[PDB]
Design a protein around this nucleic acid. Structure first.
Length: 155
RNA sequence: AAAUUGAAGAGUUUGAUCAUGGCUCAGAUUGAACGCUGGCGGCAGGCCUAACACAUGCAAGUCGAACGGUAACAGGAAGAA
């Protein structure tokens, strides 16, 4: 019972001897809403087939996120090719302050309160890749506590 | 007790892509102006330009418990109706 969200549909084209060959690419994201989120990207000669391929690729290749009561553990920075992403944990009641692709990722991921901002290029594919890379690199107090070989009294 | 609890993007270069990069938009705000329209009230605001020139009226008077006074109006007055 995971939530699936179509982020962007784009029409690309390859040229051949006869003319242009138009195909469609769809970027989606799925997530169970409590710390697991994955994005899929499918190209197809039609829009529904592209969305189906994106959903199948997104249902696999899902990552785990260490949430903290529905928000981030700490401010994180995600970077892909052109997009640089900043996410920050907020208090209860603020919502998701983020761009379209960031909103989709953080909403299907299970994040409820976050202050986010996208720098550089706002390309949807690179934005969702940067968001996923920033969320999977976010660690919890138990992780750092066990990695430091000392109790979790820092929490 | 409270008195920083706060951060959104989109369109456009290409047959298509990523990046760079500028232009434009979505938000607030104003001593505002113009166009169409216009019922009431409360609170505020109202020459941003020519520190250009000014008709007219007012905007700095007051004290007789400082003084010599009596010109005006109100009285007291002696004497002539």
């Amino acid at each position: 019972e995971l939530q699936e969200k179509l982020i962007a549909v784009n029409r690309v084209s390859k040229t051949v001897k006869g003319g242009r060959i138009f195909s469609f690419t769809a970027l989606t994201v799925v997530g169970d809403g409590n710390g697991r989120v994955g994005f899929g990207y499918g190209k197809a000669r039609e829009v529904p087939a592209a969305i189906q391929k994106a959903m199948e690729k997104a249902r696999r290749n899902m990552i785990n996120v260490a949430l903290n009561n529905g928000t981030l553990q700490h401010p994180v920075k995600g970077v892909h090719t052109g997009s640089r992403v900043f996410m920050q944990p907020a208090s209860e009641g603020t919502g998701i302050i983020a761009g379209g692709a960031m909103r989709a990722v953080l909403e299907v991921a299970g994040v409820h309160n976050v202050l986010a901002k996208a720098y550089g290029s706002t390309n949807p594919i690179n934005v969702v890749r940067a968001t996923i890379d920033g969320l999977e690199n976010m660690n919890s107090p138990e992780m750092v506590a066990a990695k430091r070989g000392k109790s979790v009294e820092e929490i």
